[PDB]
Amino acid sequence: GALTESQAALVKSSWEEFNANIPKHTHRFFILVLEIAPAAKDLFSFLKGTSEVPQNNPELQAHAGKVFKLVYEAAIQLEVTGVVVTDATLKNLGSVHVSKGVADAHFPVVKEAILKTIKEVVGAKWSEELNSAWTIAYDELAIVIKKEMDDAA
């Protein structure tokens, strides 16, 4: 709906805070994914076969860091331009996700795990506005990735 300039500023603030402790917060993110949907474990190469979510895995860390940064960058582009631009990068993400057996109905899983991660990251700074902002950003980004999935047969 929104992303006013103060909504964008909040996504940016919260993303910085997230990024201040990548080892902690990415690990936390993957724990929350599996609590929502244990079956999702099998899609991720760095998880498959583990007992617990690894705490010092650079593949896990770079993957989840990239996820959060793309949603934040989507937030700023919606706020500045009024859209999410479909580029070659998101086109490539559409093909990638179809290849790894990701489907439209998986996207709400990663959404809730992002909202809960950010909630834990900001602590007492959490607000309704913050939550709405990451929700819009995620949804608009997901629309474009799903279109390219649908498109990337």
Minimum CB distance to ligand HEM, residue 124 (Å): 27
Residue 51 CB contacts under 8 Å (≥ 6 apart), including other chains: none
Minimum CB distance to ligand HEM, residue 80 (Å): 19
Nearer of residues 6 and 99 to ligand HEM, judged by Cβ: 99
> What dihedral angle (degrees, nearest 10) is formed by the CA atoms of 18, 36, 60, 69?
-40
Minimum CB distance to ligand HEM, residue 66 (Å): 4
The verdict on 60 binding ligand HEM (CB under 6 A) reads: no
**Alpha helix stretches (DSSP H) within 37-106:** 58-80, 88-99
Nearer of residues 29 and 138 to ligand HEM, judged by Cβ: 138
Enumerate binding residues for ligand HEM (CB under 6 A). 40, 43-45, 66-67, 70-71, 93, 96-97, 100, 102, 106-107, 109-110, 138, 141-142, 145
